[PDB]
mmCIF file of C-alpha atoms and ligand atoms in Angstrom:
data_model
loop_
_atom_site.group_PDB
_atom_site.id
_atom_site.type_symbol
_atom_site.label_atom_id
_atom_site.label_comp_id
_atom_site.label_asym_id
_atom_site.label_seq_id
_atom_site.Cartn_x
_atom_site.Cartn_y
_atom_site.Cartn_z
ATOM 1 C CA UNK L 1 16.534 20.675 4.484
ATOM 2 C CA UNK L 2 17.276 18.937 1.176
ATOM 3 C CA UNK L 3 14.710 16.129 1.380
ATOM 4 C CA UNK L 4 11.323 16.403 3.085
ATOM 5 C CA UNK L 5 8.837 13.613 3.754
ATOM 6 C CA UNK L 6 5.652 15.529 2.942
ATOM 7 C CA UNK L 7 3.399 12.708 4.124
ATOM 8 C CA UNK L 8 3.300 8.971 4.788
ATOM 9 C CA UNK L 9 0.581 6.391 5.428
ATOM 10 C CA UNK L 10 1.407 3.296 7.488
ATOM 11 C CA UNK L 11 -0.948 0.367 8.103
ATOM 12 C CA UNK L 12 -0.555 -2.913 10.041
ATOM 13 C CA UNK L 13 -2.076 -5.198 12.693
ATOM 14 C CA UNK L 14 -3.246 -8.789 13.215
ATOM 15 C CA UNK L 15 -4.931 -9.754 9.952
ATOM 16 C CA UNK L 16 -3.421 -6.850 8.015
ATOM 17 C CA UNK L 17 -0.478 -7.248 5.661
ATOM 18 C CA UNK L 18 1.825 -4.328 6.535
ATOM 19 C CA UNK L 19 1.995 -1.698 3.800
ATOM 20 C CA UNK L 20 2.934 1.988 3.582
ATOM 21 C CA UNK L 21 2.802 5.043 1.313
ATOM 22 C CA UNK L 22 5.431 7.779 0.930
ATOM 23 C CA UNK L 23 5.417 11.337 -0.366
ATOM 24 C CA UNK L 24 8.815 13.046 -0.391
ATOM 25 C CA UNK L 25 10.158 16.261 -1.907
ATOM 26 C CA UNK L 26 13.708 16.072 -3.253
ATOM 27 C CA UNK L 27 15.397 18.502 -5.660
ATOM 28 C CA UNK L 28 12.153 20.308 -6.503
ATOM 29 C CA UNK L 29 10.457 17.029 -7.440
ATOM 30 C CA UNK L 30 7.721 15.162 -5.546
ATOM 31 C CA UNK L 31 7.971 11.365 -5.440
ATOM 32 C CA UNK L 32 5.074 9.149 -4.391
ATOM 33 C CA UNK L 33 5.338 5.410 -3.757
ATOM 34 C CA UNK L 34 3.723 2.375 -2.087
ATOM 35 C CA UNK L 35 5.033 -0.957 -0.786
ATOM 36 C CA UNK L 36 4.319 -3.865 1.520
ATOM 37 C CA UNK L 37 6.755 -5.291 4.069
ATOM 38 C CA UNK L 38 7.147 -7.502 7.145
ATOM 39 C CA UNK L 39 6.187 -4.590 9.407
ATOM 40 C CA UNK L 40 4.924 -1.013 9.256
ATOM 41 C CA UNK L 41 8.353 0.618 9.347
ATOM 42 C CA UNK L 42 9.757 -2.107 7.079
ATOM 43 C CA UNK L 43 7.074 -1.464 4.431
ATOM 44 C CA UNK L 44 7.908 2.257 4.659
ATOM 45 C CA UNK L 45 11.595 1.546 4.020
ATOM 46 C CA UNK L 46 10.697 -0.700 1.088
ATOM 47 C CA UNK L 47 8.640 2.124 -0.428
ATOM 48 C CA UNK L 48 11.491 4.579 0.204
ATOM 49 C CA UNK L 49 13.912 2.229 -1.552
ATOM 50 C CA UNK L 50 11.873 2.445 -4.770
ATOM 51 C CA UNK L 51 12.317 6.236 -4.865
ATOM 52 C CA UNK L 52 15.847 5.918 -3.516
ATOM 53 C CA UNK L 53 16.840 3.305 -6.157
ATOM 54 C CA UNK L 54 15.549 5.475 -8.999
ATOM 55 C CA UNK L 55 17.690 8.342 -7.697
ATOM 56 C CA UNK L 56 20.870 6.259 -7.450
ATOM 57 C CA UNK L 57 20.967 6.883 -3.702
ATOM 58 C CA UNK L 58 21.781 3.881 -1.513
ATOM 59 C CA UNK L 59 20.374 3.857 2.019
ATOM 60 C CA UNK L 60 22.828 3.147 4.876
ATOM 61 C CA UNK L 61 22.318 -0.217 6.555
ATOM 62 C CA UNK L 62 20.209 -0.355 9.710
ATOM 63 C CA UNK L 63 22.682 -1.666 12.303
ATOM 64 C CA UNK L 64 20.609 -1.098 15.447
ATOM 65 C CA UNK L 65 17.162 0.161 16.444
ATOM 66 C CA UNK L 66 15.957 1.207 19.902
ATOM 67 C CA UNK L 67 12.723 2.788 21.119
ATOM 68 C CA UNK L 68 12.437 4.328 24.581
ATOM 69 C CA UNK L 69 10.094 6.598 26.533
ATOM 70 C CA UNK L 70 10.881 9.343 29.089
ATOM 71 C CA UNK L 71 10.073 8.635 32.790
ATOM 72 C CA UNK L 72 6.397 8.801 33.806
ATOM 73 C CA UNK L 73 5.134 6.077 31.517
ATOM 74 C CA UNK L 74 1.947 6.258 29.534
ATOM 75 C CA UNK L 75 0.164 4.879 26.515
ATOM 76 C CA UNK L 76 0.222 8.372 24.959
ATOM 77 C CA UNK L 77 3.909 8.916 25.875
ATOM 78 C CA UNK L 78 6.326 10.650 23.497
ATOM 79 C CA UNK L 79 8.765 8.242 21.879
ATOM 80 C CA UNK L 80 12.541 8.396 21.404
ATOM 81 C CA UNK L 81 13.602 6.228 18.465
ATOM 82 C CA UNK L 82 17.365 5.787 18.080
ATOM 83 C CA UNK L 83 18.563 4.267 14.819
ATOM 84 C CA UNK L 84 22.174 3.246 14.199
ATOM 85 C CA UNK L 85 23.265 3.521 10.571
ATOM 86 C CA UNK L 86 26.381 2.368 8.742
ATOM 87 C CA UNK L 87 27.211 4.714 5.842
ATOM 88 C CA UNK L 88 29.756 2.330 4.293
ATOM 89 C CA UNK L 89 28.765 -0.246 1.681
ATOM 90 C CA UNK L 90 31.499 -2.370 3.308
ATOM 91 C CA UNK L 91 34.124 -1.470 6.898
ATOM 92 C CA UNK L 92 32.965 0.933 9.631
ATOM 93 C CA UNK L 93 31.121 4.225 9.042
ATOM 94 C CA UNK L 94 28.640 4.062 11.920
ATOM 95 C CA UNK L 95 26.354 6.926 13.040
ATOM 96 C CA UNK L 96 23.046 7.616 14.834
ATOM 97 C CA UNK L 97 19.887 9.664 14.234
ATOM 98 C CA UNK L 98 16.811 10.210 16.405
ATOM 99 C CA UNK L 99 13.088 10.915 16.248
ATOM 100 C CA UNK L 100 10.695 12.185 18.911
ATOM 101 C CA UNK L 101 6.957 11.658 18.382
ATOM 102 C CA UNK L 102 3.698 10.603 20.106
ATOM 103 C CA UNK L 103 3.496 7.951 17.367
ATOM 104 C CA UNK L 104 6.456 5.545 17.396
ATOM 105 C CA UNK L 105 6.074 4.638 13.720
ATOM 106 C CA UNK L 106 6.301 8.354 12.887
ATOM 107 C CA UNK L 107 9.328 8.719 15.211
ATOM 108 C CA UNK L 108 11.216 6.085 13.186
ATOM 109 C CA UNK L 109 10.184 7.968 10.023
ATOM 110 C CA UNK L 110 11.463 11.225 11.539
ATOM 111 C CA UNK L 111 14.789 9.553 12.423
ATOM 112 C CA UNK L 112 15.037 8.296 8.822
ATOM 113 C CA UNK L 113 14.397 11.766 7.356
ATOM 114 C CA UNK L 114 17.119 13.142 9.636
ATOM 115 C CA UNK L 115 19.471 10.414 8.405
ATOM 116 C CA UNK L 116 18.607 11.170 4.767
ATOM 117 C CA UNK L 117 19.271 14.894 5.159
ATOM 118 C CA UNK L 118 22.596 14.254 6.917
ATOM 119 C CA UNK L 119 23.797 12.059 4.045
ATOM 120 C CA UNK L 120 22.471 14.297 1.250
ATOM 121 C CA UNK L 121 23.644 17.482 2.986
ATOM 122 C CA UNK L 122 25.861 19.631 0.734
ATOM 123 C CA UNK L 123 29.460 19.885 1.993
ATOM 124 C CA UNK L 124 29.686 22.138 5.080
ATOM 125 C CA UNK L 125 32.886 23.822 3.775
ATOM 126 C CA UNK H 1 -16.645 -21.666 -7.561
ATOM 127 C CA UNK H 2 -13.068 -21.835 -8.870
ATOM 128 C CA UNK H 3 -11.695 -18.506 -7.611
ATOM 129 C CA UNK H 4 -12.249 -16.884 -4.209
ATOM 130 C CA UNK H 5 -11.336 -13.406 -3.002
ATOM 131 C CA UNK H 6 -10.362 -14.449 0.532
ATOM 132 C CA UNK H 7 -9.806 -10.875 1.689
ATOM 133 C CA UNK H 8 -9.176 -7.349 0.471
ATOM 134 C CA UNK H 9 -8.930 -3.925 2.021
ATOM 135 C CA UNK H 10 -9.438 -0.749 0.044
ATOM 136 C CA UNK H 11 -8.418 2.651 1.381
ATOM 137 C CA UNK H 12 -9.130 6.070 -0.160
ATOM 138 C CA UNK H 13 -10.336 9.602 0.643
ATOM 139 C CA UNK H 14 -9.329 13.279 0.491
ATOM 140 C CA UNK H 15 -5.594 13.561 1.150
ATOM 141 C CA UNK H 16 -5.214 9.836 0.482
ATOM 142 C CA UNK H 17 -3.931 8.188 -2.673
ATOM 143 C CA UNK H 18 -6.244 5.239 -3.439
ATOM 144 C CA UNK H 19 -4.751 1.787 -2.863
ATOM 145 C CA UNK H 20 -5.926 -1.773 -2.255
ATOM 146 C CA UNK H 21 -4.636 -5.157 -1.146
ATOM 147 C CA UNK H 22 -6.025 -8.411 -2.524
ATOM 148 C CA UNK H 23 -5.808 -11.992 -1.282
ATOM 149 C CA UNK H 24 -7.270 -14.592 -3.640
ATOM 150 C CA UNK H 25 -7.423 -18.384 -3.641
ATOM 151 C CA UNK H 26 -6.998 -20.231 -6.937
ATOM 152 C CA UNK H 27 -6.076 -23.897 -7.454
ATOM 153 C CA UNK H 28 -4.827 -24.509 -3.912
ATOM 154 C CA UNK H 29 -2.464 -21.524 -4.015
ATOM 155 C CA UNK H 30 -3.096 -18.155 -2.365
ATOM 156 C CA UNK H 31 -2.016 -14.924 -4.068
ATOM 157 C CA UNK H 32 -1.482 -11.601 -2.293
ATOM 158 C CA UNK H 33 -1.010 -8.283 -4.069
ATOM 159 C CA UNK H 34 -1.110 -4.520 -3.555
ATOM 160 C CA UNK H 35 -1.537 -1.511 -5.844
ATOM 161 C CA UNK H 36 -2.541 2.131 -6.078
ATOM 162 C CA UNK H 37 -5.045 3.626 -8.513
ATOM 163 C CA UNK H 38 -7.216 6.598 -9.447
ATOM 164 C CA UNK H 39 -9.944 5.223 -7.198
ATOM 165 C CA UNK H 40 -10.426 2.445 -4.659
ATOM 166 C CA UNK H 41 -12.042 -0.062 -7.042
ATOM 167 C CA UNK H 42 -9.498 0.946 -9.694
ATOM 168 C CA UNK H 43 -6.638 0.284 -7.259
ATOM 169 C CA UNK H 44 -8.260 -3.083 -6.585
ATOM 170 C CA UNK H 45 -8.313 -3.985 -10.287
ATOM 171 C CA UNK H 46 -4.654 -2.999 -10.718
ATOM 172 C CA UNK H 47 -3.745 -5.305 -7.831
ATOM 173 C CA UNK H 48 -5.979 -8.067 -9.198
ATOM 174 C CA UNK H 49 -4.433 -7.676 -12.668
ATOM 175 C CA UNK H 50 -0.939 -8.320 -11.270
ATOM 176 C CA UNK H 51 -2.120 -11.786 -10.149
ATOM 177 C CA UNK H 52 -4.309 -12.180 -13.240
ATOM 178 C CA UNK H 53 -1.239 -11.779 -15.470
ATOM 179 C CA UNK H 54 0.832 -14.209 -13.383
ATOM 180 C CA UNK H 55 -1.878 -16.856 -13.775
ATOM 181 C CA UNK H 56 -2.198 -16.071 -17.483
ATOM 182 C CA UNK H 57 -5.869 -15.052 -17.325
ATOM 183 C CA UNK H 58 -7.162 -12.001 -19.214
ATOM 184 C CA UNK H 59 -9.851 -9.828 -17.597
ATOM 185 C CA UNK H 60 -12.736 -8.585 -19.798
ATOM 186 C CA UNK H 61 -13.104 -4.868 -20.488
ATOM 187 C CA UNK H 62 -15.307 -2.749 -18.242
ATOM 188 C CA UNK H 63 -18.141 -1.558 -20.510
ATOM 189 C CA UNK H 64 -20.379 -0.011 -17.844
ATOM 190 C CA UNK H 65 -20.652 0.373 -14.065
ATOM 191 C CA UNK H 66 -23.851 1.175 -12.143
ATOM 192 C CA UNK H 67 -24.568 1.425 -8.407
ATOM 193 C CA UNK H 68 -28.175 1.522 -7.203
ATOM 194 C CA UNK H 69 -30.109 1.218 -3.942
ATOM 195 C CA UNK H 70 -33.557 -0.193 -3.017
ATOM 196 C CA UNK H 71 -36.393 2.259 -2.082
ATOM 197 C CA UNK H 72 -36.229 4.435 1.053
ATOM 198 C CA UNK H 73 -32.581 3.644 1.757
ATOM 199 C CA UNK H 74 -30.609 5.437 4.462
ATOM 200 C CA UNK H 75 -26.804 5.740 4.434
ATOM 201 C CA UNK H 76 -26.465 2.147 5.697
ATOM 202 C CA UNK H 77 -28.577 0.891 2.768
ATOM 203 C CA UNK H 78 -27.700 -2.291 0.873
ATOM 204 C CA UNK H 79 -26.184 -1.596 -2.527
ATOM 205 C CA UNK H 80 -26.770 -3.387 -5.824
ATOM 206 C CA UNK H 81 -23.833 -2.694 -8.118
ATOM 207 C CA UNK H 82 -23.982 -4.272 -11.566
ATOM 208 C CA UNK H 83 -20.900 -4.289 -13.780
ATOM 209 C CA UNK H 84 -21.221 -5.089 -17.479
ATOM 210 C CA UNK H 85 -18.260 -6.733 -19.189
ATOM 211 C CA UNK H 86 -17.160 -7.351 -22.775
ATOM 212 C CA UNK H 87 -20.705 -8.657 -28.802
ATOM 213 C CA UNK H 88 -19.569 -11.060 -26.016
ATOM 214 C CA UNK H 89 -21.312 -8.784 -23.466
ATOM 215 C CA UNK H 90 -22.420 -9.966 -20.011
ATOM 216 C CA UNK H 91 -23.245 -8.505 -16.590
ATOM 217 C CA UNK H 92 -22.407 -9.366 -12.987
ATOM 218 C CA UNK H 93 -24.088 -7.944 -9.896
ATOM 219 C CA UNK H 94 -22.962 -7.649 -6.283
ATOM 220 C CA UNK H 95 -25.166 -6.835 -3.297
ATOM 221 C CA UNK H 96 -23.566 -5.538 -0.086
ATOM 222 C CA UNK H 97 -23.985 -2.785 2.561
ATOM 223 C CA UNK H 98 -20.532 -1.610 1.445
ATOM 224 C CA UNK H 99 -20.475 -0.305 -2.130
ATOM 225 C CA UNK H 100 -16.802 -1.019 -2.880
ATOM 226 C CA UNK H 101 -17.219 -4.568 -1.511
ATOM 227 C CA UNK H 102 -20.229 -5.145 -3.793
ATOM 228 C CA UNK H 103 -18.020 -4.324 -6.805
ATOM 229 C CA UNK H 104 -15.506 -6.908 -5.542
ATOM 230 C CA UNK H 105 -18.338 -9.467 -5.360
ATOM 231 C CA UNK H 106 -19.317 -8.554 -8.920
ATOM 232 C CA UNK H 107 -15.704 -8.928 -10.064
ATOM 233 C CA UNK H 108 -15.391 -12.279 -8.263
ATOM 234 C CA UNK H 109 -18.549 -13.540 -9.969
ATOM 235 C CA UNK H 110 -17.154 -12.395 -13.330
ATOM 236 C CA UNK H 111 -13.843 -14.189 -12.678
ATOM 237 C CA UNK H 112 -15.679 -17.406 -11.834
ATOM 238 C CA UNK H 113 -17.909 -17.117 -14.920
ATOM 239 C CA UNK H 114 -14.933 -16.295 -17.161
ATOM 240 C CA UNK H 115 -12.983 -19.305 -15.842
ATOM 241 C CA UNK H 116 -16.109 -21.470 -16.270
ATOM 242 C CA UNK H 117 -17.642 -20.367 -19.634
ATOM 243 C CA UNK H 118 -20.162 -23.236 -19.504
ATOM 244 C CA UNK H 119 -21.760 -21.103 -16.734
HETATM 245 C C1 LIG Y 1 13.849 -2.358 12.637
HETATM 246 C C2 LIG Y 1 12.670 -3.292 12.774
HETATM 247 C C3 LIG Y 1 11.336 -2.683 12.326
HETATM 248 C C4 LIG Y 1 10.892 -1.584 13.289
HETATM 249 C C5 LIG Y 1 10.255 -3.783 12.225
HETATM 250 N N1 LIG Y 1 10.757 -4.939 11.425
HETATM 251 C C6 LIG Y 1 8.960 -3.224 11.631
HETATM 252 O O1 LIG Y 1 8.829 -3.059 10.419
HETATM 253 O O2 LIG Y 1 8.001 -2.928 12.346
HETATM 254 C C1 LIG Y 2 -15.519 2.077 -12.688
HETATM 255 C C2 LIG Y 2 -15.218 3.309 -11.841
HETATM 256 C C3 LIG Y 2 -14.599 2.989 -10.476
HETATM 257 C C4 LIG Y 2 -15.682 2.568 -9.484
HETATM 258 C C5 LIG Y 2 -13.809 4.206 -9.937
HETATM 259 N N1 LIG Y 2 -12.756 4.631 -10.903
HETATM 260 C C6 LIG Y 2 -13.179 3.888 -8.583
HETATM 261 O O1 LIG Y 2 -12.213 3.129 -8.500
HETATM 262 O O2 LIG Y 2 -13.628 4.388 -7.551
HETATM 263 ZN ZN1 LIG Y 3 -4.054 1.248 4.104
#
């Protein structure tokens, strides 16, 4: 682990303007940010970008996004969020990460943290 | 009434960094903003200031802040919060069952008085 999302706070709904808070640990430093957006996850990514921009890290483009649940159904069902990223700033450098969580918003966050660590991972050798 | 706070939502607590959203109406246009702060009301003022600067209006300095309740009040008690602004000193009061909302009322009253000096 090179980057850890210590905590996040996501808020939306009919009547609410989507906004989110982020707390991440990268290179011994803790970064805290807020932002609004068109949706909960979107606001989160906007907040991330502020930290990300300051660090000279560019986030891979979101190419596809899919959320599924294992058989059995439920309102409290665990969520599989698949996100397709393109590493290239353009060209094809496509790859996928996943999150599993009771909360789907958190699952997308998980899948983003996995993406971040894959791209900031020191060379395997 | 020249300015209206159409809506706001303030969120704070232990483990939470204070932040607020503001939606205000002024001269036909609606302005929406967000901001963090040291406290809920403080986060609200930071957000308000962002709009305030855009519109070219300067907010008076907070000289004092007092929150009181009428006799025998439970936890659901109505709150009278009076804020004094800056001689050039004046006060605004808000009354509401929610204490942070009563400070928003007091700030809204100040904004309307400051934009209409003739009272
Ligand atoms: C990828 C789309 C995301 C999930 C959506 N716009 C949201 O913020 O809720
Ligand atoms: C004037 C003090 C205010 C109420 C406090 N800093 C708060 O935002 O909670
Ligand atoms: Zn919130």
